[model samples]
Target: KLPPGWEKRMSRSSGRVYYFNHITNASQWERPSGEPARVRCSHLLVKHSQSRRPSSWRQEKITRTKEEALELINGYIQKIKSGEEDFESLASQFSDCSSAKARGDLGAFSRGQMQKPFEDASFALRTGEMSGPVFTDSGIHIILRTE
Candidate 1:
């Protein structure tokens, strides 16, 4: 039998059967076997002074050093791992990126849509998995793979 939350559909043009997963929002021509091409992620970004663009929604100007940003991101990771904070809520409260307005929800993205380091770290995670700290032009980030 097919996995739970999965549905099968036939293509109108070719009459080929495809599979789709509701939970992860992934679809494929073949049965689900491994990671999907697209993924959904949420992140909490803490930008440093050296970041490409240091300003954030939280402040007109950000002056924290890279070391300080790293420290802050790590502390946030601790809170999440310890169950002391929820990812979405903490992201909304502290993330520097405007995506924080959506509780850090970046929505579903394909491989080429994001920065290399961020995209690599995101794709490496399993569903519901979260990364420690991924550095990119934007800043230091904690990435959670929702798909």
Candidate 2:
């Protein structure tokens, strides 16, 4: 571990546990009087397409139909919103996005870095809040703006 006054960050819910030290990089922005801010997030994705999947989309990569993706993604959104389920767990278990391995973490991103639809919905979320199923060219997404 690093010495005191050096900032450390850690997490156990991005599909696996991880921790890191925030090294000073001159180009990067740092707080003038406080610790650097961190924003950790998790998500669940179900990609949609014209191609159809017989069953498991993960193994086959067959893609989901619009109606199919919408229904399933929306179901999970409601579940998370209603407090019946957890976002990271479901994302790790079921998301089709590459970030699924990290429990659907797109990682901490600044505004304008993501696609239009995804960017809009993601930035709109409050800490601990998740958006309803958001549609993108790749698929349907249920985002969690975790702290």
Candidate 3:
């Protein structure tokens, strides 16, 4: 909480827009009978998030197979987009933001407030749309739409 007469400068009411997705290659082979090989990868998909302080974003040391990562991310996105998971909970649980307590919330900033491409893409978003894996100096990011 903040002291009296102080301002947080931003609030969670202003949410951002974004989607999470990833690409991966998987090995597959057909048997003489045209059956797919029984062996399959078990990697999980991941939801991606961008941080106001990109340098502070948390990352898992464990490496995941690309397909698994994509699948997991896709499943989570589908749930979020369909309103299955609470945004704040999901952000708190899955997001990499140091401000995870703030639930991946990025406060208001004026035009040109950030790097050029991020500024363009962020401001360009409509409140409920999704965007992501948008590359920048901060690596890949999944930006949520906000006002």
Worst 10 residues of 1 by lDDT: 20-29
Over 33-123, each residue of candidate 1 has an lDDT whose tens digit, in order, gives: 4768899999999999999999988998999999999999989988898799999999999999999999999999998999988887778
Which candidate comes out best when scored by lDDT?
A: 1
Over 4 Å off, model 1? 1-33
Q: Candidate 2 regions off by >4 Å? A: 1-40, 51-57
lDDT of 1: 0.85
lDDT of 3 by residue, 66-134 (tens): 444445555556676678986556666765445465766666665656555555555444454344434
Give every collision pair in model 1. Answer: none
**TM-score of each model, paired residue for residue:** 0.76, 0.63, 0.48
When 1 and 2 are scored with TM-score, the better candidate is 1
Which residue runs of candidate 3 sit more than 4 Å off their true CA positions?
1-72
**For each candidate, what is the lDDT?**
0.85, 0.61, 0.43
